[PDB]
Design a binder for this molecule. Structure first.
Ligand code: LI1
Ligand code: LI1
Ligand code: LI1
Ligand code: LI1
Ligand code: LI1
Ligand code: LI1
Ligand code: LI1
Ligand code: LI1
Ligand code: LI1
Ligand code: LI1
Ligand code: LI1
Ligand code: SQU
Ligand code: SQU
Ligand code: SQU
Ligand code: RET
Ligand code: RET
Ligand code: RET
Lengths: 222, 222, 222
């Protein structure tokens, strides 16, 4: 369509769709109930992203937010996606290391705060206050990363895969608040079409890439 | 009120209300914790439907969607209802057969996708794209029905009741995408008042009827 | 700002923020997984309230509802807060007494109905119908309080702390439907600035006060 960012929404839609089908076919047959959990969690994340990318591509997951003088296009469906997919990613990690439920509740809740305050930030019409919401969101992110590194006798297989996925998690997740801040939601330093491209590369990496690492690991079997 | 479909919203409200009270009285006394789960899940479904039918009856759960040239009345509160009640129905099934958590997560998540894409479809202003959302929603439905039939040593009591409720589930759930497609949300072949009547009969059957079958079964006791 | 109720939103924001930091520091070190659950649940409640108070203070969590002839300011973010924080409060209670899952599902679901019908009531433009939603909401509240008193060999420590928190719960929770009914959401007998002050005192008491009682108890350790 008109919107130049359309091609990145179309590619994202396609890549999430293909990833969903791949993981779906891949988990056919699996009977190990622990493996089943990782396959469910891990197939569901790009299925949800597929629907949210498609909603952006079709125009449904877009709204206009007045701020800094103008009508800023804001892809709210990114935050619907993340609201459900980032806790499932953290569940994949938590399950791997057999986390305490209290620890899982702290992570899912901090994550909810992260995404929800990010969405408030994205929809806030008072420009300076958008960055107050960003800061709080970023503090929840930093709580989550802290817990992943200082909050957790696993089998050596779990440990190696967990350490890989944890490091993937820190580099990819930490990029999101930077893209937001320099993109059209924040300081407007990078244009929306480039902003959309960067979140597309992160999304596919953090969903389909992450899942490929994890579903190839023997850490997922009991 | 003016809206001819009001009588079906009023009857639905009444039938869900009476069903809620019946199951509520019925489960008084029960102490078998397994039975308690089935009674909770099963009383909660028509209590939620009661509130959503009433919201439609009062006009709150209605909005107007422009598409195909006109202002189409869309009862969004149907999708709020279903968003919470269809996973609880699937939980009743999953519990009955002592499903793996991975299997339950796949079902609840596919269900979320089903209802959420149905709601996007219902609110989409570009007429052809409403049916893309319908198709995806229907594919999630077909995943869920597949799992119920090819994804599951139960006691013979569980097996007989599960088989009954599973067959109820397939016939009733499969009717919903057809009603949507022929009703005012889709091709507009059947008028809104008839559409509302058909979803009312399905809703009461799939909630109050289903629950009556299940709560009469000894399959629910440990 | 202009709104006289701002000072109560500012104090609430501050008190929830300080409470969040206090519980956060307080739970550093804890390793007893049961204690961890109570600390997570209990730190998360004022963290969420902090964000929702701040959203009200900044103006984001406010909307205007036409009814009784006028444009009534309605702080919808109170209901987002409560939607997540009241089930976590009930979880703290349920965990304490080692409730049956069926009993926990009945409580969380009745609670969802309570808050959701309260939000419908708050946003309903037909004045008489606001009180139909209030009545249903209040009936869900009374179900929840019934269960807390007639639905539950605990260690004597659990019993004493549970009995304290249960009595706190009844007096504080029962005040909310009264404030709503006499405040600007309901009969408009008490002005919005006083209404906001009363919910602020209840909120801080029911979150930060409650949590202080509970986290000081040895009932939370295995
Ligand atoms: C948990 C535990 C802890 C909770 C975290 C605390 C922070 C709370 C944040 C929450 C608040 C939600 C934000 C809400 C969308 C605000 C809506 O108002 C918008 C701006 O005035 C209106 O924009 C108009 C359009 C906008 C679009 C917003 C849509 C969004 C979609 C996400 C909903 C999903 C649910 C899937 C349902 C099917
Ligand atoms: C920061 C506290 C410690 C945390 C508490 C929450 C507060 C968060 C906001 C920080 C604060 C400076 C925000 C003020 C933004 C202000 C510079 C924008 C300039 O105002 C311009 C008109 O006056 C807006 O036009 C438009 C001009 C724009 C292009 C300006 C872009 C703004 C940028 C904001 C970047 C914030 C970071 C760099 C935060 C670092 C941590
Ligand atoms: C760090 C700690 C919390 C910081 C409190 C803030 C300080 C703002 O005080 C007033 C100075 O004008 C702002 O009121 C001026 C009127 C406006 C009110 C702004 C107050 C809020 C924008 C900030 C309240 C706390 C924030 C917390 C920022 C995120 C934190 C978790 C890192
Ligand atoms: C997206 C590109 C990577 C740009 C970022 C530039 C960094 C380039 C290298 C990425 C990093 C890779 C880390 C390798 C890991 C392997 C080490 O594992 C350790 C052994 O247990 C774990 O201990 C402790 C683990 C330690 C590793 C923690 C991760 C670090 C975080 C790196 C920055 C983040 C991404 C922020 C992006 C940037 C814009 C600020
Ligand atoms: C899970 C796991 C997987 C998630 C599934 C993936 C598919 C994502 C779908 C989700 C997105 C939610 C749709 C959202 C209502 C869109 C809102 O925008 C509408 C159309 O522009 C605005 O219409 C204006 C009015 C409309 C009304 C919509 C209201 C709805 C109500 C449902 C909310 C409920 C929550 C109960 C809260 C009390
Ligand atoms: C289908 C793919 C395999 C799945 C991928 C997603 C695409 C889903 C949409 C299928 C597609 C044909 C939709 C096109 C609808 C088109 C016939 C409507 C006619 O256009 C009219 C004006 O040109 C609209 O006015 C109004 C006239 C209306 C009364 C027309 C009603 C439309 C009907 C659509 C029915 C779709 C099914 C019959 C799908 C069977 C599976
Ligand atoms: C709403 C009315 C029923 C209209 C539909 C017309 C069909 C009339 C009979 C309904 C069906 C009843 C099935 C009986 C069942 C009993 C068999 O149990 C089997 C023994 O384990 C289960 O194996 C395998 C189980 C097999 C049964 C699977 C269910 C079938 C699905 C039937 C269609 C669906 C409803 C779609 C509605 C229509 C508009 C397409
Ligand atoms: C469970 C189990 C059982 C469910 C209980 C049954 C009762 C169902 C109630 C639910 C319905 C939700 C109400 C919904 C906000 C209605 C929206 O329409 C409003 C009035 O027409 C539009 O006002 C315009 C603005 C308004 C603002 C409303 C925003 C609200 C915010 C709450 C969302 C939170 C999710 C955090 C996401 C980030
Ligand atoms: C009640 C049933 C058993 C439960 C079923 C659901 C019905 C709930 C509503 C009860 C019903 C009387 C509500 C009618 C409100 C009516 C008195 C308001 C007067 O109408 C005025 C114009 O005619 C409205 O202007 C504005 C004037 C206002 C200041 C009037 C305030 C209204 C007050 C309502 C208080 C309701 C309780 C006192 C409920 C006690 C339980
Ligand atoms: C007590 C039991 C349920 C009470 C049913 C109500 C009675 C209303 O009947 C009609 C009298 O005019 C209202 O229709 C007149 C047109 C309007 C329709 C109003 C009916 C609804 C407002 C009430 C439906 C039941 C309510 C339940 C109130 C809460 C209950 C759970 C305590
Ligand atoms: C907010 C202020 C308190 C105003 C309310 C006026 C009441 C003043 C005293 C508050 C009450 C304190 C109860 C003490 C408790 C201790 C007893 O424990 C018992 C021993 O197991 C529990 O049995 C059974 C437990 C019994 C206690 C159940 C609680 C009672 C409920 C009190 C009313 C509620 C608040 C409604 C507010 C008002 C506006 C209607
Ligand atoms: C290993 C196989 C079978 C995977 C392919 C399934 C689905 C689609 C491609 C997903 C691959 C991506 C790897 C994750 C990491 C990222 C940094 C990818 C970002 C995009 C790069 C574009 C180059 C080609 C692609 C179409 C993958
Ligand atoms: C078995 C008893 C005690 C049940 C009655 C409790 C609550 C209300 C009626 C619910 C009954 C419905 C059976 C489920 C199946 C359906 C196909 C019903 C659709 C509607 C039919 C209208 C005929 C009468 C009714 C008012 C039930
Ligand atoms: C015990 C300690 C360390 C607590 C302080 C941490 C956080 C802030 C204050 C929370 C205290 C409140 C007690 C709960 C009960 C309520 C009825 C309080 C309502 C407000 C009263 C105003 C008086 C002073 C306050 C700022 C606490
Ligand atoms: C599937 C996509 C994933 C893993 C997305 C992760 C998104 C985040 C970590 C977002 C973080 C943000 C902040 C920390 C600051 C405010 C803006 C956000 C929401 C982009
Ligand atoms: C309590 C009500 C129940 C059991 C409702 C079930 C609803 C569905 C199975 C809806 C399905 C739909 C599709 C498959 C296609 C798009 C439209 C929907 C949402 C009606
Ligand atoms: C953290 C805040 C808490 C514990 C808030 C509790 C809120 C309630 C118990 C609200 C109850 C209401 C009703 C019973 C009637 C309708 C209005 C409400 C939502 C205020």
């Amino acid at each position: 369509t008109g919107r130049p960012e359309w091609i990145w929404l179309a590619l994202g839609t396609a890549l999430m769709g293909l990833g969903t089908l791949y993981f779906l076919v891949k988990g056919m047959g699996v009977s190990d109930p622990d493996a089943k959990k990782f396959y469910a969690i891990t197939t569901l994340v790009p299925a949800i992203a597929f629907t949210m990318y498609l909603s952006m591509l079709l125009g449904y997951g877009l709204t206009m937010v007045p701020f800094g003088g103008e009508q800023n296009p804001i892809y709210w469906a990114r935050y619907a996606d993340w609201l459900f997919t980032t806790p499932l990613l953290l569940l994949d990690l938590a399950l791997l290391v057999d986390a305490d439920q209290g620890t899982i509740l702290a992570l899912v809740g901090a994550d909810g705060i992260m995404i929800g305050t990010g969405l408030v930030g994205a929809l806030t019409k008072v420009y300076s206050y958008r960055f107050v919401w960003w800061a709080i969101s970023t503090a929840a992110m930093l709580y989550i990363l802290y817990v992943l590194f200082f909050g957790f006798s696993m089998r050596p297989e779990v440990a190696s895969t967990f350490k890989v996925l944890r490091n993937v998690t820190v580099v990819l997740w930490s990029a999101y608040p930077v893209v937001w801040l320099i993109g059209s939601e924040g300081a407007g330093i990078v244009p929306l079409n480039i902003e959309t491209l960067l979140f597309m590369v992160l999304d596919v990496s953090a969903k389909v890439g992450f899942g490929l690492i994890l579903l190839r690991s023997r850490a997922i079997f009991g």
